[PDB]
Design a protein around this motif. Structure first.
Motif, PDB file in Angstrom:
ATOM      1  N   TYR B  63       4.408  83.059  17.974  1.00 40.10           N
ATOM      2  CA  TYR B  63       5.241  82.626  19.086  1.00 40.10           C
ATOM      3  C   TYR B  63       4.362  82.229  20.259  1.00 40.10           C
ATOM      4  O   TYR B  63       3.301  82.813  20.479  1.00 40.10           O
ATOM      5  CB  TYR B  63       6.219  83.723  19.519  1.00 40.10           C
ATOM      6  N   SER B  64       4.813  81.230  21.014  1.00 43.18           N
ATOM      7  CA  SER B  64       4.072  80.781  22.181  1.00 43.18           C
ATOM      8  C   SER B  64       5.041  80.386  23.283  1.00 43.18           C
ATOM      9  O   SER B  64       6.209  80.078  23.039  1.00 43.18           O
ATOM     10  CB  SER B  64       3.148  79.606  21.850  1.00 43.18           C
ATOM     11  N   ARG B  65       4.526  80.400  24.506  1.00 44.01           N
ATOM     12  CA  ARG B  65       5.294  80.035  25.690  1.00 44.01           C
ATOM     13  C   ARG B  65       4.324  79.443  26.698  1.00 44.01           C
ATOM     14  O   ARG B  65       3.386  80.126  27.121  1.00 44.01           O
ATOM     15  CB  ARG B  65       6.012  81.257  26.266  1.00 44.01           C
ATOM     16  N   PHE B  66       4.529  78.180  27.071  1.00 45.32           N
ATOM     17  CA  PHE B  66       3.595  77.512  27.966  1.00 45.32           C
ATOM     18  C   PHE B  66       4.229  76.261  28.557  1.00 45.32           C
ATOM     19  O   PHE B  66       5.192  75.712  28.018  1.00 45.32           O
ATOM     20  CB  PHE B  66       2.298  77.139  27.239  1.00 45.32           C
ATOM     21  N   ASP B  67       3.664  75.824  29.679  1.00 46.05           N
ATOM     22  CA  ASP B  67       3.896  74.484  30.187  1.00 46.05           C
ATOM     23  C   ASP B  67       3.007  73.496  29.439  1.00 46.05           C
ATOM     24  O   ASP B  67       1.994  73.863  28.841  1.00 46.05           O
ATOM     25  CB  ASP B  67       3.607  74.412  31.686  1.00 46.05           C
ATOM     26  N   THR B  71      -0.961  63.503  28.715  1.00 47.63           N
ATOM     27  CA  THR B  71      -1.773  62.403  29.210  1.00 47.63           C
ATOM     28  C   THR B  71      -1.649  61.235  28.244  1.00 47.63           C
ATOM     29  O   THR B  71      -1.597  61.425  27.028  1.00 47.63           O
ATOM     30  CB  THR B  71      -3.245  62.813  29.360  1.00 47.63           C
ATOM     31  N   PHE B  72      -1.588  60.029  28.790  1.00 51.88           N
ATOM     32  CA  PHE B  72      -1.358  58.817  28.017  1.00 51.88           C
ATOM     33  C   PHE B  72      -2.510  57.859  28.260  1.00 51.88           C
ATOM     34  O   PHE B  72      -2.705  57.391  29.389  1.00 51.88           O
ATOM     35  CB  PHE B  72      -0.026  58.170  28.398  1.00 51.88           C
ATOM     36  N   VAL B  73      -3.268  57.576  27.204  1.00 56.90           N
ATOM     37  CA  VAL B  73      -4.355  56.605  27.243  1.00 56.90           C
ATOM     38  C   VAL B  73      -3.873  55.352  26.527  1.00 56.90           C
ATOM     39  O   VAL B  73      -3.556  55.394  25.336  1.00 56.90           O
ATOM     40  CB  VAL B  73      -5.632  57.163  26.595  1.00 56.90           C
ATOM     41  N   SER B 118      11.480  58.443  33.131  1.00 57.38           N
ATOM     42  CA  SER B 118      10.729  57.304  32.628  1.00 57.38           C
ATOM     43  C   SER B 118       9.416  57.190  33.385  1.00 57.38           C
ATOM     44  O   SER B 118       9.345  57.485  34.580  1.00 57.38           O
ATOM     45  CB  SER B 118      11.533  56.008  32.758  1.00 57.38           C
ATOM     46  N   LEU B 119       8.378  56.770  32.672  1.00 57.04           N
ATOM     47  CA  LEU B 119       7.038  56.622  33.216  1.00 57.04           C
ATOM     48  C   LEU B 119       6.618  55.172  33.042  1.00 57.04           C
ATOM     49  O   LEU B 119       6.586  54.664  31.917  1.00 57.04           O
ATOM     50  CB  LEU B 119       6.063  57.566  32.509  1.00 57.04           C
ATOM     51  N   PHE B 120       6.319  54.506  34.150  1.00 52.09           N
ATOM     52  CA  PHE B 120       5.844  53.130  34.132  1.00 52.09           C
ATOM     53  C   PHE B 120       4.342  53.138  34.374  1.00 52.09           C
ATOM     54  O   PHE B 120       3.875  53.659  35.390  1.00 52.09           O
ATOM     55  CB  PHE B 120       6.565  52.286  35.182  1.00 52.09           C
ATOM     56  N   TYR B 134       8.162  75.060  30.407  1.00 48.93           N
ATOM     57  CA  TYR B 134       8.634  75.569  29.127  1.00 48.93           C
ATOM     58  C   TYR B 134      10.112  75.227  28.973  1.00 48.93           C
ATOM     59  O   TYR B 134      10.941  75.646  29.787  1.00 48.93           O
ATOM     60  CB  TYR B 134       8.410  77.077  29.032  1.00 48.93           C
ATOM     61  N   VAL B 135      10.439  74.457  27.938  1.00 46.35           N
ATOM     62  CA  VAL B 135      11.770  73.889  27.779  1.00 46.35           C
ATOM     63  C   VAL B 135      12.431  74.354  26.483  1.00 46.35           C
ATOM     64  O   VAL B 135      13.343  73.704  25.989  1.00 46.35           O
ATOM     65  CB  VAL B 135      11.729  72.351  27.853  1.00 46.35           C
ATOM     66  N   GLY B 136      11.981  75.474  25.925  1.00 43.69           N
ATOM     67  CA  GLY B 136      12.597  75.996  24.719  1.00 43.69           C
ATOM     68  C   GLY B 136      13.934  76.656  25.020  1.00 43.69           C
ATOM     69  O   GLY B 136      14.112  77.317  26.043  1.00 43.69           O
ATOM     70  N   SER B 142       8.836  78.858  18.646  1.00 50.11           N
ATOM     71  CA  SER B 142       8.633  79.410  17.312  1.00 50.11           C
ATOM     72  C   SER B 142       7.758  78.446  16.523  1.00 50.11           C
ATOM     73  O   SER B 142       8.209  77.365  16.132  1.00 50.11           O
ATOM     74  CB  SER B 142       9.965  79.644  16.604  1.00 50.11           C
ATOM     75  N   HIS B 143       6.502  78.833  16.298  1.00 47.85           N
ATOM     76  CA  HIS B 143       5.643  78.065  15.409  1.00 47.85           C
ATOM     77  C   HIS B 143       6.049  78.237  13.955  1.00 47.85           C
ATOM     78  O   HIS B 143       5.718  77.389  13.122  1.00 47.85           O
ATOM     79  CB  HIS B 143       4.184  78.482  15.593  1.00 47.85           C
ATOM     80  N   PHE B 144       6.754  79.319  13.638  1.00 49.42           N
ATOM     81  CA  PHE B 144       7.250  79.580  12.298  1.00 49.42           C
ATOM     82  C   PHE B 144       8.669  80.114  12.410  1.00 49.42           C
ATOM     83  O   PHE B 144       8.980  80.879  13.326  1.00 49.42           O
ATOM     84  CB  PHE B 144       6.352  80.580  11.554  1.00 49.42           C
ATOM     85  N   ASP B 172      13.594  70.906  18.567  1.00 49.15           N
ATOM     86  CA  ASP B 172      14.180  69.589  18.812  1.00 49.15           C
ATOM     87  C   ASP B 172      14.002  69.259  20.289  1.00 49.15           C
ATOM     88  O   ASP B 172      14.792  69.687  21.133  1.00 49.15           O
ATOM     89  CB  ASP B 172      15.651  69.572  18.408  1.00 49.15           C
ATOM     90  N   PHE B 173      12.960  68.490  20.602  1.00 54.69           N
ATOM     91  CA  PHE B 173      12.617  68.164  21.980  1.00 54.69           C
ATOM     92  C   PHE B 173      12.880  66.705  22.327  1.00 54.69           C
ATOM     93  O   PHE B 173      12.441  66.245  23.384  1.00 54.69           O
ATOM     94  CB  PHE B 173      11.152  68.503  22.244  1.00 54.69           C
ATOM     95  N   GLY B 174      13.582  65.970  21.475  1.00 52.75           N
ATOM     96  CA  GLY B 174      13.808  64.565  21.734  1.00 52.75           C
ATOM     97  C   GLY B 174      12.624  63.723  21.296  1.00 52.75           C
ATOM     98  O   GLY B 174      11.762  64.157  20.528  1.00 52.75           O
TER      99      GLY B 174
HETATM  100  C1  LIG Z   1       8.682  60.760  31.882  1.00 52.83           C
HETATM  101  C2  LIG Z   1       8.293  60.000  30.623  1.00 52.83           C
HETATM  102  C3  LIG Z   1       7.081  60.633  29.953  1.00 52.83           C
HETATM  103  C4  LIG Z   1       7.482  61.572  28.823  1.00 52.83           C
HETATM  104  C5  LIG Z   1       8.096  62.868  29.330  1.00 52.83           C
HETATM  105  C6  LIG Z   1       8.032  63.925  28.237  1.00 52.83           C
HETATM  106  C7  LIG Z   1       9.004  65.066  28.494  1.00 52.83           C
HETATM  107  C8  LIG Z   1       9.354  65.771  27.190  1.00 52.83           C
HETATM  108  C9  LIG Z   1       8.182  66.610  26.695  1.00 52.83           C
HETATM  109  C10 LIG Z   1       8.555  68.079  26.534  1.00 52.83           C
HETATM  110  C11 LIG Z   1       8.886  68.431  25.089  1.00 52.83           C
HETATM  111  C12 LIG Z   1       7.749  69.211  24.442  1.00 52.83           C
HETATM  112  C13 LIG Z   1       7.693  70.639  24.977  1.00 52.83           C
HETATM  113  C14 LIG Z   1       6.694  71.452  24.191  1.00 52.83           C
HETATM  114  C15 LIG Z   1       6.920  71.653  22.758  1.00 52.83           C
HETATM  115  C16 LIG Z   1       5.745  71.862  21.854  1.00 52.83           C
HETATM  116  O1  LIG Z   1       5.462  70.641  21.208  1.00 52.83           O
HETATM  117  C17 LIG Z   1       5.981  72.949  20.806  1.00 52.83           C
HETATM  118  N1  LIG Z   1       7.323  73.494  20.859  1.00 52.83           N
HETATM  119  C18 LIG Z   1       4.999  74.094  21.016  1.00 52.83           C
HETATM  120  O2  LIG Z   1       5.316  75.181  20.178  1.00 52.83           O
END
Ligand SMILES: CCCCCCCCCCCCC/C=C/[C@H](O)[C@H](N)CO
Lengths: 300, 237, 56, 300, 170
Positions: B63-67, B71-73, B118-120, B134-136, B142-144, B172-174
């Motif tokens: 299990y993990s919890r983090f912000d 970064t986009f190259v 949105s990011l331009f 953290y958006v869980g 849950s890694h497993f 499910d994070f979109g």
């Molecule tokens: C504003 C446009 C740029 C894109 C914005 C991205 C926002 C959505 C990203 C957050 C979703 C991922 C949160 C972290 C999840 C990890 O991949 C795993 N759950 C870690 O266990």
């Protein structure tokens, strides 16, 4: 948490502020008569009879003004108990006497290599993984009041000598560790062209000090001059010098001793004149770690 | 006696994950929409399992919890020498949380992004960057997950009640939708957006033995590299 | 890595006496080995590992 | 509101300032002997007779040093009243005894799956939407002083096992939840190529611990060793472990029990020797929520 | 040279083995010779090193006047010195009874008429291991178990450093 420092104004028509933005200090910007400012770099003297163990000797420099010392508990890397032979190993051993002639280009030795077969010091050196020791080196050369000549004795930390081949760093372990016989400087560089059975030996040129530097500057190292009109001997007290508090004595030689004839030997009108030079080295503050079976390095 | 002044600062779980790991290479094109081989927008299901290194590091723990710092190259190139040149491109990266409408065209209404973040990004600028908390929906990631999203009930046919083993909406994070905002130049341009993911403010629970054979899919399956260890004599130093 | 200048030494096991069993007893047995770090153990310079790779 | 923190200076020729510019803390930058530093990760023991309900049992690890406990009011997600059966469900249930032979590759079980048909605990599990419980697992295996062999018992949170097909995550619910019979590890990976009627079952390879990790490292999980020369049994006290305070017991298995023969069974000179292994599991601190009609999952 | 010792005798066997060993530390353990010539055992045979020597069940006289062995003939029941073995228990000793214990530890201080002596000339202690009860096992007449000695010198101190001594061998 701003740091307000003062500037040194030159051309006048006075404080500058600096703030560190990173947690790691490596990210920081740089902050910035006869009396010798570096008294320790001008070969300070011990200011008789030197007795170590059961050996006694009756012109003494302390290299960098630092007497030999044992490892401080604050700077001890190894954790196992250190073996300190004391008087058993810390005593004066006399190497083979060399002969100074009118044609000699100089002699060199490595420490602790030159003492590897010296009584119990060699046994302790080859029985342990780690070893440490300073030295007292006593060079002896006596001649009449009608002899003239000068020897420069230099103690060089990390005395690396140039090779004799186009292959870089090709001197093999056996030739780099000759023992108490040491080696001799040469007056010219001779390239080893035997690609079948290369000698893989050093070619230390005297005026290049064997390492590509002019011999005249070798006096920046700890040194002593034996001028035959003035003194018979030279004593050099070398502390342990290394990037580590203790290392492998078989792998690494901490010091090198170089004796160069600064003024050629001469006497009366005899073109055939030779006087011996005798080296007596006493290791000091010996300590060893990592006892196991004895090391037996390859020879010849 | 020895004074033991050695610290474990770089082996903290924070320092262990304090790096930008590449998790996605999203390929998009700027070209005439009449062309059919060109993909004018790309959708990437957000995940760390498209690559192995960060996945293996994360799966040291259950299990993990983090912000998360993203970064986009962005890199781009000409696909042809003739047909002229192009002006500097602008890229839209729209986050689509699960449920939000998914664009079907590179220029449909969804790109209005009235509510989706949105990011331009302007090509040639320093790599874009954003942070996410953290958006869980659970109290930790849950890694497993040893279970199913559905429980098949007695009576219903084998087609019903079936779900993939170990799959749950906990991950499910979109997705990310990426497009070039510029209209097409007379020449086709190809761009790649590399996504680098850094966990920060990290907490982990229930350490696990690391992956020893090649990853095979999003689960714990293995097929090919099942002999990881080499040969070495029992009494050979 | 495997580096001669920082090699760590050797570990071995030997029979001090022999293994003795009575009759009606297995004459061959197994031993297992475990390795861990002590509390004075530290590491430095995080780097990528060679134990995982991704083809394509 | 500047934060002035101290740097740890290394190479010397010392404070750095940080200010947060965003309202959201996710925008912030990162701030940064035998004694075991993680005492809880080295399988701490309960430092006899264990009585739970009307059951009594006469080498005990507490997983992560955390005893089973009820949900704190501070961490309660559901709002309806929780059902706590107490002694009715919290009691020792004995699963079917397995047979340890010289050829066994190991056994596995899932919790709460293995207790789904165990008295009132199963009834409560299938009558409620949400369930939570720790466990006490007692593995029993006795043999003479002339037997030799060792078993490793591991309690794995989120014990996910690999499949047997090219299709990822294809193991169906029925095969992933066998009940008290559990399943067995295999010595090799066999791919299911029946595309018409796929088995859709696990293929847990023993030396891969059934999940692509080397079995030797399974000791990082809570564990206990039954060495036949030393002890008969092993007790594991498992607290509730999950990313949620309470979940669905039918959907999700919180723990997995793995028994692997670390040393193969052997005896005298009889190649035919088998000893039973008996598992007795008592759920602890059970609590259920969301009462409705009973769940009847599909079987076979 | 001067040093005490810690002697650890190790001998392990099953619960179905029977046998007893007596370990004795004897100061000035002088062993009888094998010839009519008194005190004729030569230095090489009196100092075998880590291999040591073995007691014998009977006294055999060396009659080779041309090439005498010049070796000891230690008779076990005479304890190798003309004394009954039963009284050897007056010396510091320990019994390894196979039914009870595996090993025996003897801590020997430096014993001599001098505070320090020559280690090459003089042996301060002798270690004797005698089977008090013969080894036996089940019904196998062919049974052997190892005995391993581990000796640690203690409080070592040496004086008079010079070139190394190289005693004659064989
Ligand atoms: C504003 C446009 C740029 C894109 C914005 C991205 C926002 C959505 C990203 C957050 C979703 C991922 C949160 C972290 C999840 C990890 O991949 C795993 N759950 C870690 O266990």
């Amino acid at each position: 948490g701003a740091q307000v420092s003062s500037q040194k104004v030159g051309a006048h028509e006075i404080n500058y502020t600096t703030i560190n933005y990173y947690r790691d200090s490596a990210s920081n910007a740089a902050s910035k008569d006869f009396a010798q400012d570096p008294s320790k770099f001008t070969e300070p003297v011990k200011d008789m009879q030197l007795t170590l163990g059961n050996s006694t000797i009756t012109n003494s420099v302390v290299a960098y003004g630092r007497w030999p010392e044992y490892i401080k508990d604050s700077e001890a890397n190894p954790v196992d108990q250190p073996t300190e032979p004391a008087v058993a190993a810390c005593r004066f051993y006399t190497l083979d006497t060399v002969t100074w002639r009118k044609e000699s280009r100089g002699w060199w030795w490595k420490l602790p290599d030159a003492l590897k077969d010296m009584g119990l010091f060699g046994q302790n050196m080859f029985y342990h993984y780690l070893g440490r020791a300073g030295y007292t080196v006593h060079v002896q050369c006596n001649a009449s009041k009608f002899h003239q000549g000068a020897l420069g004795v230099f103690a060089v930390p990390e005395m690396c000598l140039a090779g004799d081949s186009t292959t870089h760093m090709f001197t093999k372990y056996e030739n780099a560790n000759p023992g108490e016989k040491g080696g001799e400087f040469k007056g010219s560089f001779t390239l080893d062209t035997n690609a079948t059975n290369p000698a893989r030996n050093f070619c230390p040129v005297d005026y290049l000090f064997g390492s590509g530097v002019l011999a005249g500057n070798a006096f920046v190292y700890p040194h002593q001059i034996i001028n035959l009109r003035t003194n018979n001997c030279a004593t050099l007290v070398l502390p342990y010098v290394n990037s580590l508090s203790i290392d492998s004595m078989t792998k690494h030689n901490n010091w090198g001793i170089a004796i160069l004839p600064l003024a050629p030997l001469d006497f009366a009108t005899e073109s055939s004149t030779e006087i011996p030079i005798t080296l007596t080295i006493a290791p000091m503050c010996c300590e060893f770690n990592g006892l196991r079976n004895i090391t037996v390095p390859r020879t010849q | 006696h020895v004074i033991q002044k050695r610290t474990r600062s770089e082996s903290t779980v924070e320092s262990f994950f304090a790096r930008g790991a590449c998790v996605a290479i999203i390929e998009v094109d700027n070209d005439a929409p009449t062309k059919r081989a060109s993909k004018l927008f790309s959708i990437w299901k957000i995940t760390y399992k498209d690559t192995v290194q960060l996945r293996r590091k994360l799966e040291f723990f259950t299990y993990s919890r983090f912000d998360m710092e993203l970064t986009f190259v962005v890199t781009s190139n000409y696909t042809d020498a003739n047909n002229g040149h192009a002006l500097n491109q602008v890229y839209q990266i729209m986050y689509i949380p699960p449920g939000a409408p998914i664009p079907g065209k590179w220029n449909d209404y969804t790109w209005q992004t009235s509510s989706n973040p949105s990011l331009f990004y302007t090509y040639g600028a320093p790599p874009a960057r954003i942070s996410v908390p953290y958006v869980g929906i659970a109290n930790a990631y849950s890694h497993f997950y040893d279970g199913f999203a559905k429980v098949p009930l007695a009576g219903q046919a084998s087609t019903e009640g079936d779900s993939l083993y170990g799959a749950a909406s906990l991950n499910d994070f979109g997705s990310l939708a990426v497009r070039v905002v510029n209209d097409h130049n007379p020449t086709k341009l190809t761009s790649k957006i590399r996504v680098y993911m850094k966990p920060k403010h990290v907490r982990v629970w229930c350490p696990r033995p690391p992956r020893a054979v090649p990853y095979y899919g999003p689960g714990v399956d293995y097929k090919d590299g099942l002999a990881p260890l080499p040969e070495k004599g029992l009494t050979t130093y | 890595i495997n580096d001669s200048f920082t090699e760590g030494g050797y570990i071995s096991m030997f029979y001090q006496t022999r293994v003795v069993v009575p009759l009606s007893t297995p004459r061959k047995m197994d031993i297992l080995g475990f390795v861990s770090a002590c509390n004075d153990f530290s590491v430095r310079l995080l780097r990528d590992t060679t134990h995982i790779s991704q083809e394509a």
